[PDB]
Each structure stands twice: as structure tokens, then as C-alpha cells.
Design a protein around this ligand. Sequence first.
Ligand code: HEM
Ligand SMILES: O=C(CCCCCn1ccnc1)N[C@@H](Cc1ccccc1)C(=O)O
Length: 454
Amino acid sequence: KEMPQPKTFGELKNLPLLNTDKPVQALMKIADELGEIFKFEAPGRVTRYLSSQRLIKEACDESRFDKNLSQALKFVRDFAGDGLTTSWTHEKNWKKAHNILLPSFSQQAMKGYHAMMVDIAVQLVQKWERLNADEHIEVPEDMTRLTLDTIGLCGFNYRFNSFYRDQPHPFITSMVRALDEAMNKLQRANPDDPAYDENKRQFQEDIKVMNDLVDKIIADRKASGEQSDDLLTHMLNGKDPETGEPLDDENIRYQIITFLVAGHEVTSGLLSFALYFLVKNPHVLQKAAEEAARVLVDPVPSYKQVKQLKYVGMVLNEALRLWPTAPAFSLYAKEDTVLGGEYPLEKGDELMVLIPQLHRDKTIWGDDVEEFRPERFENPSAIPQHAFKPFGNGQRACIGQQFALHEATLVLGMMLKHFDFEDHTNYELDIKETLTLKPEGFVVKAKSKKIPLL
Ligand code: HEM
Ligand SMILES: O=C(CCCCCn1ccnc1)N[C@@H](Cc1ccccc1)C(=O)O
């Protein structure tokens, strides 16, 4: 089969289609038009966007395909270095860091982080308890305060104190601006044009800011000798069972930057979308609120109670189905192979997995794919293989999946226990795209149920 291709712009091929405010949603519309696979060409680049479970289940075969760094990840590597997400699988630092960090990210390690996650979750609840009657909540803004603070505390015992300020932390200003520059280079038809020279100068200054601030955090911890149960201690003390080597200080810095990128808007996007879908689906909200009240019987949730918030876990998975906040990942063929029995690929050929479109495959989910129905996730054995991939695939899957879902389940549970919510503006969904997705301008009113935290 010859695969389709969207409209072209002469020598720029398909590249101008990405010069738009919402490229992921633009790619989803192209997929709707062209189907489960289409070719996408730019100067010096060819990739193929996959959207059906039929083809993606083959792409997830790790004997045939390995993780590729998309152009986006290549630009993020300019400041995330060989941290886990921007490393190639064959780089020595990928497997070393993966072996060392896996026990820090397990379901068992979440027991150790739980107290710190509660610390920040309680600050969010108290903020909302303290609003006056006429005020509202800026949802993505507050969810990002929560997730940033949680990863700072669990990551290296650092308090960003986001609920005490309007103006972001200096590290975050550079990190957000670096991510902004990474996404902007994707959309430049002529990136060598001198009008981008201070953009490039600014990008180099932001890299130096992040590096110096994180390096000081590491030097300060080594100097004090204190042993906290955070990711920094584990990286300073851990040894890779295979090579027997610890991480070096440069790589630890890259891992910290990587966790901070991941724990910022990618996780807060999930909480924002989940609350959006709950207020748009009051019957689902009521069921989740009933579970929260039945399970969260103590003033602050325990680790074990968060594990019992099963329906809230389903709400979060259904929010990830519709708007996965890391919406794509890239693969390359390790050898010549045939995809779906119709599309021959040569060694090195690249694939993009378009996750939001995969998650709308009507042959998997039925006709009602656009509806928010957490009950789809009652039994993971009833979901076909590779139909649901919001955390990536295989050995390159998200190491932070348990962390993100524990944090999100805890805080959504507390939110549902402590407040009734009003969609007071009848908010129209507007998905702002960076390298992640979020519902821009989403606002609600939260009326306290006046249940104490003591
Ligand atoms: C809802 C929240 C999150 C989602 C949807 C998400 C999604 C993803 C996805 C799709 C990948 C694979 C990327 C690729 O194949 O190119 C990935 C990898 C990764 N994520 Fe997450 N993530 C989330 C939260 C987090 C958190 C909270 C952390 C750490 C604190 C984290 C750390 C990582 C790392 C280190 C990798 C690379 C793992 C490796 O390649 O060995 N993520 N994530
Ligand atoms: O399709 C995408 C969407 C974004 C994927 C990477 C962003 N993200 C998501 C989760 N974690 C990182 N990105 C391609 C775009 C592109 C295609 C062809 C030529 C140039 C650019 C890429 O970045 O290579």
C-alpha cells in the first residue's frame, strides 16, 4: 500500500503544517482525514504518523522498534542532556540511570514520598478553603503549583513555595523559556535566519541558569551530608547493579532537570483535564465524590487509602485517554520490517505514535469515543494490547508513571472530599499546546464542604 500524505508547500514539503498554534490538534485532524498512517516530510526529515491500534501494536514490539528522539526531544536534549527522557537506549548513561532509579519510582517507593505529597496537597486545599465567596480558581495555574512543588520536595527536598507567590521561581522562568524555544524551533521555516539570533542567545543563557542552579543544589547536598529520602539521595548513593557504577554529578544534574520538566506541566495537565471532565460530567463527578467520601475517612489520606480510590484512578485514566499530556512519541525500525503487512520499512525509518488519535480508535473503544466514561477502565484485561499508551512503551516507558498517578489520585481525592465544584463560566475547552497540553483559561468555583483537616 502507498501511504497518504497531507498537502505540501513545494520545497518545504509538509513543514508549514506545523507552523500553527495547535500542532497536535492539527495532526489529529489530518489523521481523521487520511486514516491510520500518513507520511510527513520536511527538509531533511521523513516520518510516518500512526493512529490505529492495529499498527501501533506492531510498533510497540521492542524487538523491531526502539525509541527515537523526535526533533522536539533533540532540542530538549540541549538542556536535559543525557537525562533519561532525552537519552538513546544505546547510551551507557540510559541503562545505568534506568537501573539505578527504577526502585526510587516503584509503587513501594511511593510509600516514602506519600507524606511529602500530602504536605503540598494540604496547601492546595487550604488555599481553596481560604478564598472569599466571590472568587474563583485558575485550575491549570494551581495544579502546576501543586505538581511543581511536589516534585521539588520529593526530588531534592527543595520548597519552591509556589502557593506563596505569583512570580515563578528563577529556575522555572528559564526552564519554561527553554521549552518555549525548543517548540519554536520546530515551527521555523528558516531557522538559520539572523532574526533568531537573540532567541539563540537567550536559549544559551537559560541553559547556563538551569545548570548553575541545579549544580549548586547537588554541591550543597554533598556538603551537608544529610540523607533525606528524596531522589537526590538515591542518585548520590545508588550503584548500577550491572556496571557497578554510580551516576556522575553531571548526569545527576540532567536527571534533576528532567524530573522538573516532567513534574511541571505534563502532570498538572492531567489534573486540569480530569477536573475539566468531572465538572462537564456531573454524574461522573458525583460517583467520584461518593468514593472519596467513603474512602478518605481520616483528616489526611494515608498511602493505603489512596490505593483504594479505584474510581478516581479510572477518572484519571479516562482523562489520559482523551487528552494524554505527553501526546506523542517516536520510534525507529531496528531492521527492515513490514508494518501491518502492507507498509515496508527500511532499517532506520522513523514512526510517530499520535497518542490522542490512537485513543480514539473506534474499533477498540466503540462509537462513543468522545464521551467521558471512566468505567472503560474497570478491567485492564478487557483492553486490547497497546490500545492505551499515555505513558509510552516498553523499557522506555515513563519511569514516573506511579509517581504521577499517586500524586494525582491523592489530590483529586482530597479535592472531591472537600469541595463541591461549579463550572460557573460554562467554560469552552481551549487546549493550549506547548510540548504538552492543557486547558487554557479553565476556571471553577469551589464551595467548601467544611470538613476539617485536623
Ligand atoms: C501524567 C503525567 C505524565 C505523563 C502522561 C508522562 C508521559 C511520558 C511518556 C509518554 C514517556 C515516553 C516518552 C518517549 O517515548 O519519548 C515518558 C517518559 C519519561 N517520563 Fe513521564 N509522564 C508523566 C509524568 C512524569 C513524572 C511525574 C516523571 C518524574 C518525576 C516522569 C519522568 C519520565 C522519564 C524520566 C521518562 C523517560 C524514561 C526513560 O526513557 O527511561 N514523567 N513519560
Ligand atoms: O509530532 C510531533 C508532536 C510532539 C512530539 C514531541 C513532544 N513531546 C510530547 C511528549 N513529550 C515530548 N513532533 C515532531 C514534529 C516534527 C515532525 C516532522 C518534522 C519536524 C517536526 C517532532 O518533534 O519531531
